[PDB]
């Protein structure tokens, strides 16, 4: 369930591994922000 | 407990607790109830 | 046994969850340095 | 997949995969096979 | 086997928990760099 990894790059971008895939994006600022729907897909598997 | 607990480079503490994502300035003593004051920035899926 | 989380803040302070409690302190530079005995207790439970 | 995955403060991605330590600039798109180009910086023991 | 935690300080030093002990050092630069053999032991137990 949820993320396997969740962490920041030093430039303040949020990265996460979810369902073996890698995502990044600006971190959310309220629970109304669906982060995973807007996050940039940057790895399609293997994570 | 928390599943993830980690800093942003601007020094904000982030944690995932009960599937929810929270941020806040880090607690400064054993009297500081972090979860009661942290900003809820995601509810579910974390 | 040991810590559940152990990570840095961006100013160089070491943070750690140990026995569900949160601690912080300047990291040790030798194994003679009992870090947990000097660390600041910043959370008494729930971590 | 990875056992650890994390940044160095200069912006380089580090990962432990199959006991090995790898680093490299993070991927920009899912067309980028990161593990295939990452620099192997440790062969075992991670 | 391997490490329980592996992470950076903001000054670029690699830290690792290995067999309950805390180590630090410049990150390895190649597979010919035996890191654990040259890392600085900074904690002998409890991690
Ligand atoms: C761990 C890793 O490098 N995985 C990459 C994946 O993210 C990328 O989408 C693909 C491009 O073909 O090459 C991989 O499998
Ligand atoms: C992992 C993730 O992105 N979870 C978000 C959640 O935090 C947010 O509360 C919800 C409604 O906006 O949308 C979810 O998808
Ligand atoms: C996870 C969290 O916020 N834990 C805090 C704890 O560290 C603090 O000692 C107490 C009241 O002081 O409030 C708790 O629940
Ligand atoms: C954890 C660690 O230090 N592992 C190193 C490995 O990365 C390196 O490839 C090898 C030969 O130099 O020495 C091992 O001890
Ligand atoms: C987690 C912690 O602080 N462990 C310390 C250890 O690194 C140090 O070698 C020792 C010296 O007495 O004090 C230990 O218990």
Author numbering:
A (entry chain B), C (entry chain H), E (entry chain F): 2 to 48
B (entry chain D), D (entry chain J): 3 to 48
Give sentences from the paper:
We characterized the evolutionary trajectories and selection forces underlying emergence of β-propeller proteins, a globular and symmetric fold group with diverse functions. Second, tachylectin-2 is an immunoprotein that agglutinates foreign cells by multivalent binding of surface GlcNAc- and GalNAc-decorated glycoproteins. The repeating motifs encode both the globular propeller fold and the rigid binding of saccharides between propeller blades.
First, we show that single ancestral motifs inferred from the sequence repeats of the extant propeller yield a functional lectin via oligomerization. The best performing sequence from the first round of selection (Anc1B library) was subjected to error-prone PCR at a rate of 1.6 mutations per motif. Selection identified a single mutation, F23L (AncB1B), which was incidentally an ancestral state predicted with low probability; this mutant exhibited similar total binding capacity to AncA1B. AncA1B and AncB1B were purified with a sugar ligand (GlcNAc) resin and eluted indistinguishably from WT tachylectin-2 in gel filtration, indicating the formation of stable pentamers; additional peaks corresponding to alternate states were not observed. The pentameric single motifs showed a bell-shaped curve of concentration-dependent folding efficiency, indicating that native pentamer formation was favored at higher concentrations but was simultaneously compromised by misfolding intermolecular interactions (blue lines). Single motifs unfolded in a simple two-state transition.
